Design a protein around this nucleic acid. Structure first.
Ligand SMILES: [Mg+2]
Ligand SMILES: [Mg+2]
Ligand SMILES: [Mg+2]
Ligand SMILES: [Mg+2]
Ligand SMILES: [Mg+2]
Ligand SMILES: [Mg+2]
Ligand SMILES: [Mg+2]
Ligand SMILES: [Mg+2]
Ligand SMILES: [Mg+2]
Ligand SMILES: [Mg+2]
Ligand SMILES: [Mg+2]
Ligand SMILES: [Mg+2]
Ligand SMILES: [Mg+2]
Ligand SMILES: [Mg+2]
Ligand SMILES: [Mg+2]
Ligand SMILES: [Mg+2]
Ligand SMILES: [Zn+2]
Lengths: 52, 199, 51, 190, 131
RNA sequence: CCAAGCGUUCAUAGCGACGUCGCUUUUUGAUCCUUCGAUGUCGGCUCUUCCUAUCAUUGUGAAGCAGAAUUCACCAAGCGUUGGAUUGUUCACCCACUAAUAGGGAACGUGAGCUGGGUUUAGACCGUCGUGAGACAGGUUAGUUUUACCCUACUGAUGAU
RNA sequence: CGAUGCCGACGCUCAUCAGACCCCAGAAAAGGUGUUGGUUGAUAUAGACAGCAGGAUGGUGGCCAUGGAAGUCGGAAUCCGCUAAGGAGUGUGUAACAACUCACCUGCCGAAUCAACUAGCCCUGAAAAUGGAUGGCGCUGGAGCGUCGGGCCCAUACCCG
């Protein structure tokens, strides 16, 4: 078990992310375009899905 | 007799273009410090260029060529060869008028080095552009004497520094001497100033 | 088959007849099990029990 | 478009002395000295005044990319001032569901050993950057404190530890174990 | 924990060996060998202690016309050991087992190689003697 | 590529209609440019090499990723990608092992390398067709596989400046 | 490789597959918060756009439809009062409670900010087999792309002989 505050700390680094739909790059939560050239800096981002 | 050039801070292809035309007119050229030569563009895209060259080999017998020389001097030499008609007697004669060196071995270490401002990186590149170092590029494609050449180039610079201090000393005496004998040489100093030699 | 039609040459990587053996070779990691002493004459006796 | 001039200024606290060797910035303060070379940027650095010193950064005839470098230099110089006066103190918490993460500090805080991370027998040994000291936190359990005068050395040191404890071949949304940077403060609060 | 060493393989695919248990099968016909990756043109081969896949050519009808897992317990090809001993047996024999390695029968006729006995404790318990 | 839908929910984890844009030349075509004073016609065997449109393995990102298993994507062709029954087969199918049992080019690689099972001469049988002689991308059986000492390439061996 | 070794002119462009000259010898849709230029529309010293407080409720859990949805899930409607204000509601969560964040608003500091399009160059889209070709070397204050200058080079063409 993890203290809920520490869980939020870990989630900031493992869960609170956006995911490029074309190249799956991990991105900061406020990302609007990917940072990778391989996808042409697309704006087709989606949230990193939450673990159940 | 011999045109000695210093490869540090020169862009590879512009130096080769000028050097090639020079040895085709019958002049001897020595380029030293080929590891100090530069290439425009980031290092990585220039490393990929040599790796692409490195893949060119006779599929049925690699020993028959192309020969991929790894020394910064030989890389430069092959680049000048690519700007000459080397399959004719006239081109091969020119190619023999060029010597290329990593570092500055004798006797050129104790001779004055000229530069080519039309190939200098400070002149020809925008300051914000990336560039590669021939020595680093050569070191990362199989060149083995980067560490030794630097070791011997540091010994040379230590000796050249002592030589420079001796020359500054002999110049401080030269200025003092001109004050001591100012009375006796004043007449000859007027001739020179009258004609622009001395300001 | 010593090659395909193209390249129209025999490649350096195809098996051919020729010299076998008498090749220079370097082999590593051969452990020393014993450094044996040579024969000695001591007090008029040959000492040779190095095995 | 090239802009005729773009500039920004930095205020220097009285207890900090800044000297310029070309574009090399030397900041001397109570906690030590930091030297940073900005020769990779074509700007003009100027020290103004004597009683309340200031540092000015100028970029004449800059396009969009070159203008973005003007503030970057100011922010770095300010961090150097922050380092030599207050220092940098990153804190890290170790997170684990089952296996406690044991951390041992060696070599006067320049080496970190991490044991039993997700129960692994492998021992992780992270070497801090020069000028950065790691220490276990006497105030809280399962915490580390990294301190130093250079923000990039301190923050790079912490990134090394955080990436040392990475989970592999598992669902990292479930297996959250690791040591993470939990706070970015200053050694001396002032 | 102690892994078995390589031994000479005397039984390629197609070898018909004796069946040395009381299942009813008389002989075992090797159709493949466990753990063999192999290469072009090389037949999978088996030695004492190896689990193989076999069919019964002679024996009770219920045991025929199907593939059994078996283990080789003796071999006529001489194999070296680490003490320098070259051992071989008078005949090639095996016993039918299951995937877990436990015998389908209950008794073994003849000796059983030490290489196989150490590897298969269920076969070892049934071995009248060990070589 | 768009996104109506599917996915309990939810267009885009994974898929995806109606439409539409391409790439490839390991399919078949279309054409008839080269070769009819001849470029040996399938398949296998053997042997080397190369491609990546990645099956496995190394490092990774994403899941409708708890674990295990699996699926999607990235850098990536270094190293592997097997033993067999039936068939001339390519193809196919099944048995079995395996980390995996990926897909391909090299004159549909490779007959002065083999083999000659098939196809494709002359003998002969059957069926259908033909008055017949004879015919049949219909079956069947038997049917000669030539030369290197030249040049190069390659492998080794003397040597030459 | 003959001729720019001109103190040539004004811009654009960075490519971890750059680009580089009729025929002609390789690329499309669709994309980019890379960068540049334009069009239209907003809002801002009555202090804009970030950043740094509160608020989740008064009729009311609006009534339907509900096993159950209270602002939060589907379908037609979708009002008022106190006010700096407060959607009868964007998002959090179940099998139902439970729960929270935006719309909104002022407190701060003080010059431009936001959005939709459009077109250049660059980038993604963009995979093949021997090693490999802007002709090559190479070239990035260009030896690239667009617009333009002087000058110069040479055909068996033109001129004089
Ligand atoms: Mg080598
Ligand atoms: Mg075979
Ligand atoms: Mg649906
Ligand atoms: Mg024709
Ligand atoms: Mg025609
Ligand atoms: Mg002919
Ligand atoms: Mg032929
Ligand atoms: Mg690939
Ligand atoms: Mg798993
Ligand atoms: Mg063929
Ligand atoms: Mg042939
Ligand atoms: Mg033949
Ligand atoms: Mg035949
Ligand atoms: Mg016939
Ligand atoms: Mg008839
Ligand atoms: Mg005339
Ligand atoms: Zn992306």
């Amino acid at each position: 078990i993890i203290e809920p505050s520490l869980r939020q700390l870990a989630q900031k680094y493992n869960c609170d992310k956006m995911i490029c739909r074309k190249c799956y790059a991990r991105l900061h939560p406020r990302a609007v375009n990917c940072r990778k050239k391989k996808c042409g800096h697309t704006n087709n981002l989606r949230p990193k899905k939450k673990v159940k | 007799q011999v045109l000695v050039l210093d490869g540090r801070g020169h862009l590879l292809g512009r130096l080769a273009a000028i050097v090639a035309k020079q040895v085709l007119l019958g002049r001897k050229v020595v380029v030293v410090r080929c590891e100090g030569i530069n290439i425009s563009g980031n290092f990585y895209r220039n490393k990929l260029k040599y790796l692409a060259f490195l893949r060119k080999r006779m599929n049925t017998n690699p020993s028959r060529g192309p020969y991929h020389f790894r020394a910064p001097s030989r890389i430069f030499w092959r680049t000048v060869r690519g700007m000459l008609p080397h399959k004719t007697k006239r081109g091969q004669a020119a190619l023999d008028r060029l010597k290329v060196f990593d570092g500055i071995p004798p006797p050129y270490d104790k001779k004055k080095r000229m530069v080519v401002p039309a190939a200098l990186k400070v002149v020809r590149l925008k300051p914000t552009r990336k560039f590669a170092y021939l020595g680093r590029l050569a070191h990362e494609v199989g060149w083995k004497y980067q560490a030794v050449t630097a070791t011997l180039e540091e010994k040379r610079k230590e000796k050249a520094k002592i030589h420079y201090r001796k020359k500054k000393q002999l110049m401080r005496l030269r200025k003092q001497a001109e004050k001591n004998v100012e009375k006796k040489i004043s007449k000859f100093t007027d001739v020179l100033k009258t004609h622009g030699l001395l300001v | 088959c010593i090659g395909a039609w193209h390249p129209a040459r025999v490649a350096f990587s195809v098996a051919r007849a020729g010299q076998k053996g008498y090749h220079h070779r370097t082999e590593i990691n051969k452990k020393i099990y014993k450094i044996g002493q040579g024969y000695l004459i001591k007090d008029g006796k040959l000492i040779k029990n190095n095995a | 478009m090239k802009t005729i001039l773009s500039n920004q200024t930095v205020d220097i606290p009285e207890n900090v002395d800044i000297s310029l060797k070309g574009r090399t910035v030397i900041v001397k303060g109570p906690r030590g000295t930091l030297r940073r070379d900005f020769n990779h940027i074509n700007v003009e650095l100027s020290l103004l005044g004597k009683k309340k010193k200031r540092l000015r950064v100028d970029k004449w005839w800059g396009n969009r990319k070159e203008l973005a470098t003007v503030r970057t230099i100011c922010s770095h110089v300010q961090n150097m001032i922050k380092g030599v006066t207050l220092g940098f103190r990153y804190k890290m918490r170790s997170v684990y569901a089952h296996f406690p993460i044991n951390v041992v500090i060696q070599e006067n805080g320049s080496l970190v050993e991490i044991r039993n991370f997700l129960g692994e027998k492998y021992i992780r040994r992270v070497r801090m950057r020069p000028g950065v000291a790691c220490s276990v936190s006497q105030a809280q359990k399962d915490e580390l404190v990294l301190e130093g005068n250079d923000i990039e050395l301190v923050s790079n040191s912490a990134a090394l530890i955080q990436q040392a404890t990475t989970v592999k071949n598992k669902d990292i949304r479930k297996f959250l174990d690791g040591i993470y940077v939990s706070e970015k403060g200053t050694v001396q609060q002032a | 924990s102690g892994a078995k060493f390589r031994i000479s393989l005397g039984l390629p695919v197609g070898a018909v060996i004796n069946c040395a248990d009381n299942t009813g099968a008389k002989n075992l016909y090797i159709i493949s060998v466990k753990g063999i990756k192999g290469r072009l043109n090389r037949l999978p081969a088996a030695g004492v202690g190896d689990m193989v896949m076999a069919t019964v050519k002679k024996g009770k009808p219920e045991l025929r016309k199907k593939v059994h897992p078996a283990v080789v317990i003796r071999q006529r090809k001489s194999y070296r050991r680490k003490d320098g001993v070259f051992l071989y047996f008078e005949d090639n024999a095996g016993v039918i087992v299951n995937n877990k390695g436990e015998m389908k029968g209950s008794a073994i006729t003849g000796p059983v190689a030490k290489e196989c006995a150490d590897l298969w404790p269920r076969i070892a318990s049934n071995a009248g003697s060990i070589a």
